[PDB]
């Protein structure tokens, strides 16, 4: 019944370094276990960086090592991770684990992403797609909000408050020309249901701390 | 740093059949070999303790079995659910490492995408710029081709696109393509179309609007 969670930053300049705190809830890390950090990059396998024993215990990975030290606050049930020197490479999602017995890892974090770039933070602007002009068809019609020039990434996208799942396809973002993210989430609906029903996407921006919500009509 | 290699790296399955991966090893890591089950924007998975013990909540068509330098992960049968990435890790030495991945594509019976086209919003010309977008619903095989036509011409560099991951339901891709273009050329044109060349159509389909 154990869960952990991961917060820190979402962007941070190269040649800066890296700050990540992981919050464990149901269980004291004083007492048992020894917790873990592990990265994945973007389309790539999964990296072990160390661990923190309950007794205060630390090792590392060899390499990226120098970089990295990995300290615990006992009092608030958590336990941190420090990255320095960070390039391009470092940008990846950052995992919260539990070494458990025989090294095999039975509890994950939900993940957080860092990602490293000079760049400043923006600032989505959340414009409506119209759905299709026939609604005397009856078949199946498709909206969507579209979310564009943000930075960095991610964003979340929920429709009705998370009450409409069903049928909802957000596409991942593609950077734009202009250096900025960009997306477009869409889901499909019975044609009938338009006028009847109303569609509100959920927009929401951590780094920018950015909600927009947008009701969706022809 | 041990080191583990698995194959295939991409695998490309029919539904309800099996499926199998294999993980060799740099050294005989003994009993001590776990494998992990990574669907898209999620934490990895445990699958299997070390060698092949269940999890208390895996599904018997998974599997595994291995001993020394050689392991083996066995779908018994694949199902939708299924449509992930899979890792194997060892669990003998420090440091810990974890295998290069095992995609596994669902081979679904071909279906054709239904196509949408959206006009851009009357709040984002006032911003000076116009977006169109072209909607590929579900579709399988991912491969298709989008073709944009403003004022029957064909249009290049002007278009970016985006496909999502593989629905664990009906197992089917999604596609969008967006056509960016300045309000002052924007309105300098009538009609603009989205061309659409699937597996699934037996002609070209193109959805289009005007003003």
């Known amino acids: 019944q154990v869960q952990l969670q991961e917060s820190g930053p979402g962007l941070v300049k190269p040649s800066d370094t890296l700050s990540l705190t992981c919050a464990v809830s149901?269980?004291?890390?004083?007492?048992?276990?020894?917790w873990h950090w592990i990265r994945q990059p973007p389309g790539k396998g999964l990296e072990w960086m160390g661990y923190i024993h309950y007794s205060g215990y630390t090792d590392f990975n060899p390499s990226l090592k120098t970089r990295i030290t990995i300290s615990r606050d006992t009092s608030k049930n958590q336990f941190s991770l420090k990255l320095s020197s960070v390039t391009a490479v470092d940008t990846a999602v950052y995992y919260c684990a539990r070494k458990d017995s025989g090294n095999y890892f039975p509890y994950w974090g939900q993940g957080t992403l860092v990602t490293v770039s000079s760049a400043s933070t923006k600032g989505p602007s959340v414009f409506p797609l119209a759905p299709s002009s026939k609604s005397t068809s009856g078949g199946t019609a498709a909206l969507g909000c579209l979310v564009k020039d943000y930075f960095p990434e991610p964003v979340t996208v929920s429709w009705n408050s998370g009450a409409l799942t069903s049928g909802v396809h957000t596409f991942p973002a593609v950077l734009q020309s202009s250096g900025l993210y960009s997306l477009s989430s869409v889901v499909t609906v019975p044609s009938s249901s338009l006028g009847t029903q109303t569609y509100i996407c959920n927009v929401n921006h951590k780094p920018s701390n950015t909600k927009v919500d947008k009701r969706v009509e022809p | 740093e041990i080191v583990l290699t698995q194959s295939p790296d991409f695998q490309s399955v029919t539904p309800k059949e099996k499926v199998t991966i294999t993980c060799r090893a740099s050294?005989?890591?003994?009993?001590?070999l776990h494998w992990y089950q990574q669907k898209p924007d999620q934490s990895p998975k445990l699958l299997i303790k070390?060698?092949?013990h269940a999890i208390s909540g895996v599904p018997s068509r998974f599997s595994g079995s291995g001993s020394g330098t050689d392991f083996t992960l066995t779908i018994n049968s694949l199902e939708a659910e299924d449509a992930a990435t899979y890792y194997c890790?060892?669990?003998?030495?420090?440091?810990?490492?974890f295998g290069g991945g095992t995609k596994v594509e669902i081979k679904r019976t071909v279906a054709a995408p239904s196509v949408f086209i959206f006009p851009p919003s009357d709040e984002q010309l006032k911003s000076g710029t116009a977006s169109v977008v072209c909607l590929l619903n579900n579709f399988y095989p991912r491969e298709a081709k989008v073709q944009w036509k403003v004022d029957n011409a064909l249009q290049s560099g002007n278009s970016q696109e985006s496909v999502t991951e593989q629905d664990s339901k009906d197992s089917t891709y999604s596609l969008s393509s967006t056509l960016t273009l300045s309000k002052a050329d924007y309105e300098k044109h009538k009609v603009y179309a989205c061309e659409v060349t699937h597996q699934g159509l037996s002609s070209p389909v193109t959805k289009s609007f005007n003003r």
């Open positions: 149901g269980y004291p890390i004083r007492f048992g276990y020894s």
């Open positions: 050294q005989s890591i003994s009993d001590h």
């Open positions: 070390y060698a092949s």
């Open positions: 890790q060892q669990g003998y030495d420090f440091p810990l490492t």
